[model samples]
Target: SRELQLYFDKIVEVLLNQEETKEAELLRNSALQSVRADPGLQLVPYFIQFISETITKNLKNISLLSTMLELIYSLLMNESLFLEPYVAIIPCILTLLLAKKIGNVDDELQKQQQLALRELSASLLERVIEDFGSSYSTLKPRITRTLLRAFVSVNNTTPGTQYGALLGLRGLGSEVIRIVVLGNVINWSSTFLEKLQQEDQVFLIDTLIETLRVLTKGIDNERLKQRVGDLIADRIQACDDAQDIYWGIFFGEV
Candidate 1:
């Protein structure tokens, strides 16, 4: 498969050496079009493999990392043939989303950059699940389960991990938010707010507000509704806007 090596090397040289991230989209599209032009379509798997390997290698390079992620996004967005090896590709993305840290960060700026990559990871997962979730019913549950697991024991986990998982679930929509986020958290959120940071407490509220905007929009879980109703009633302190989100959902305010 010297031909395969040459084929991938051909694209890698063009993509990996780009002087600006702006050209990433240009190169991704043009490169994909060239791959599509190859009549045999034989380049597909090698292309995906190349991107995956490059992603792993460049994890510490934020520019390169985003380019690779966007490359994968374009690959998924552009080619139907590309998904045949999704079993190989999706896990690489999941790793980025669930990673404790993306790059070595001795300073606060780099720390925030890590958050950006994690958000991109979640966005990628959301796109794939929406595009493929129906035919792959079990895929949603499996991914949701993994994210929910990460969302738990937040006090013991890394700083950015829970937020990334929450971002991923936010895309899975309101019913899921109600069942997974609300059903589990509201009952425990009051106590755990002590465990979460001042900023993170309100961050969780922001998440609840957005998702509950949807919940405010499931009637079946009436028991949880009544349960949350009492919790929201007794825990009324709005200037903080932390508990405001909890009561907001039960009262259909947000």
Candidate 2:
């Protein structure tokens, strides 16, 4: 693992400092090949741990952190090659997915890139759930808990985190959508709707509606589907803006 650590560090340096150079490209591809070829992938856990440490330690280096996530994203793309070993770090990946910001890059372009990272992390999560969800019995609960914790309270959590949670819950498929999300929509909606009166959280409303839309998919029982929509509408009806957004998503107007 020590040698693997050195190898990853060297490549990361090349990737961060000399991104456009040929050596950096060569090193990047080589590292991918190494990851792909490691039978049984004993090194994958170490790699995930290294990525977590690097994210915390290099908070100021957004480029480095983004590159590290990109490494994980690349590994995840090859489902047959790398998915199993990567499952151990789904929690870490979820943290990144719901992360509000990274480092101190506040410029518009940097902010845009940070948003891109969040989207990438979300995509990685969906891929994991889509490919290996059925086999991992405990994964759904962990994912549900992570998302719910983000939106459990309106004051402490940001709209971005809530949005990520909505997206993540939607990705966990219908069973979780029913058990974890739809089950709590009424309480969650009431909390956010009341919070919206005190603050402008239009995005939160939009996200909740989108989340509801996802949960309602393939719901053959019209009564159950309508019940979900009615609950959301009832909670947000006091706020015209929030109500419109909710209706827009519920009726597919937006």
Candidate 3:
């Protein structure tokens, strides 16, 4: 009963106190640092759930958003260490980051939310690299383009939403990244584009191109990389010829 109570206390503390500035930052930093080397840590999933619900319930709270971004920023800037034990945080953080971007207007909160989400999503991708680097090959495909579709909405117009999608595709590793690229080229070039006049589907073309760029980062495979690069290049040329502006142009072609 003592262990159980202690576990629940930890859970409740994170959920309730994460809103406080000093207390929340301390707990957030503790949770991040704790997960690094402690595979025996049982509180991560609980803490993740706590953080998720906390954010979901109080989506308007800018302070909570800042904390979330800080956690993500730490992971992104520090990837030289072994982080496989804490890899589970990847999907949860990504899901929350993109959750704010869906089917909603791009307001100030969404803008701040997107900035935080992109930072966290990129960090999640960094954590995945650490896991995959350690004998965990065979990456999964982005079925239904699930993560991309969630954040990309015709009803909502936001450039950061595409950044979120690109981070997800990059996290799925290079092979799935390949499928996304070719898939978009075919989907856009075909009459499929006409079938769905909705802007959401049109955004898939953007997501695919963004995925291709982020995934190929640091890739040294000259021949293979060049081949994929050529296809991406060719697809962009055609898309632009079709009067389709690339999303990267929104971010100043970064």
Candidate 4:
């Protein structure tokens, strides 16, 4: 047990020091930087194991909770070199997804995990939009599609995941998100909206409103923002109460 403890300590030390390094920076020059970079690739799973053990393995060391939170934050904050490949492990993401789906993991772990994911995803999206630029001609559609599905899934399963989802979407940069939506998201949203209504899910509207706020942070692009405007209009028209509010707000000659 002490040997494993030493190994975990070494892993934690490497991660802690990684926060100060430029490993993520060197790799962005090209995709090949993925080779042998991101030391966290191996240890992160170990940390996840420790977390799972702490929660489900009947370990008595509950004091490790705060450390786990701190480590998650550290992993995400230093996640540039690893973001793409880490995202490639969609199965592990699904583990957290299904954990939420099952309605387990308790409230504290849910809250902490949500915060950690928020930090990680925020950094990841920021780097992506900055590195790739906001063009539908690029990977914007894929990113947005993945995120939208993730947000909806988390909203359905994990109560805390929505806030993290919002934070992550906010980091995607409005222009990129608009491009993504205009290009590809239109096909998926209608059915999503229908399901929201069928389930009487007001939280879906709240999530959308939050998403719009994140996309249009400033500059009053309300008129030129065609895609978002169309989406808001579509949703408002679909709901009775929201429709009344929409008319009340926008019924002037236009």
Listed in order, each prediction's TM-score against the native is 0.62, 0.64, 0.53, 0.43
**Pairs in clash, predicted candidate 2:** none
* Superior candidate under TM-score, 2 versus 3: 2
Candidate 1 lDDT over residue span 132-196, tens digit each:
43463236566656655555545423455445555564555333655554545344355345445
lDDT of 2 by residue, 85-111 (tens): 445346556566645445334442336
In model 4, what are the clashing residue pairs, if there are any?
Answer: none
Total clashing residue pairs per candidate? 0, 0, 0, 0
> What stretches of model 1 exceed 4 Å from their correct place?
1-5, 13-29, 32-41, 103-107, 110-119, 133-137, 153-177, 185-194, 197-254
- lDDT tens digits, residues 1-254, model 3? 55975665576575535366667667767765644434343444555555667666655545555665565445334433334555544455445544553324345432555555565565555455434654553233342354345434342334455445455645455535555444554333333243345545455556545544444443444565466653456546555554333444323234
The best-first sequence of candidates by TM-score reads 2, 1, 3, 4
For model 4, residues 117-232, the per-residue Cα lDDT tens digits are 44554454444444433341244344456656765553454334433443444345554444543444443345345344454546644554454434434334555445365345
The per-model lDDT (C-alpha) reads 0.56, 0.56, 0.49, 0.42
| Residue 66 in model 3: lDDT | 63
Q: Given candidate 4, what's the lDDT at residue 86?
A: 41
Worst 10 residues of 1 by lDDT: 101-110
Superposed model 2: Cα runs more than 4 Å off: 1-30, 37-42, 79-87, 103-110, 133-137, 154-157, 169-175, 197-242, 250-254
- The total of clashing pairs for model 3 equals 0
Candidate 2: C-alpha RMSD to true structure equals 5.5
